[PDB]
Design a binder for this molecule. Structure first.
Ligand SMILES: Oc1cc(O)c2c(c1)O[C@H](c1ccc(O)c(O)c1)[C@H](O)C2
Ligand code: NA
Length: 156
């Protein structure tokens, strides 16, 4: 069953710059989020279809997360990936997809339109706590990437 949710978030960064930074998420996140220890390609080239493994600590404990790159519509500033395994996939969920689209924002900025697509085994529904975490992973990344660009003018 599919359950979809949409959120918006604004930034004073132009979408072109924000989008280049998003593509470099594997590099950026281990530097800026203490809990993220490593992002590595298992299979694929980095492009849509690529599977990645992530070493993360959650409440002091080492854990693993599996990502699949879904699509990278460059002309429309779009980066989609999904969580297909590990701690951040609930036992009742097949897959959780995080979409991110960037369009123009006030005063030279952009608005991030985020989309959460939750795929569940059978007819189980995402629980309220799962969804709360999902939206927070969504804003959190955008916020993290966003913080990186604001702190680093000279390179995007
Ligand atoms: O604010 C956070 C906190 C996290 O624990 C994570 C965040 C953001 O995003 C990470 C992430 C998300 C997408 C990527 O392509 C990537 O290399 C890393 C990961 O989900 C783990
Ligand atoms: Na780190």
């Amino acid at each position: 069953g599919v359950f979809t949710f949409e959120d918006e978030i604004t930034s004073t960064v132009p979408p072109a710059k924000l989008y280049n930074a998003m593509k470099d998420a594997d590099s950026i996140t281990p530097k800026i989020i203490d809990d993220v220890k490593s992002v590595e390609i298992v299979e694929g080239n980095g492009g849509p279809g690529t599977i990645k493994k992530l070493t993360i600590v959650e409440d002091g404990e080492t854990k693993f997360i599996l990502h699949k790159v879904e699509s990278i519509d460059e002309a429309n500033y779009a980066y989609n990936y999904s969580v297909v395994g590990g701690v951040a996939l609930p036992p009742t969920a097949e897959k959780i997809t995080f979409e991110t689209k960037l369009v123009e924002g006030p005063n030279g900025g952009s608005i991030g339109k985020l989309t959460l697509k939750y795929h569940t085994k059978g007819d189980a529904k995402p629980d309220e706590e799962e969804l709360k975490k999902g939206k927070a992973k969504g804003e959190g990344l955008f916020r993290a990437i966003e913080g990186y660009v604001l702190a680093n003018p000279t390179q995007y």
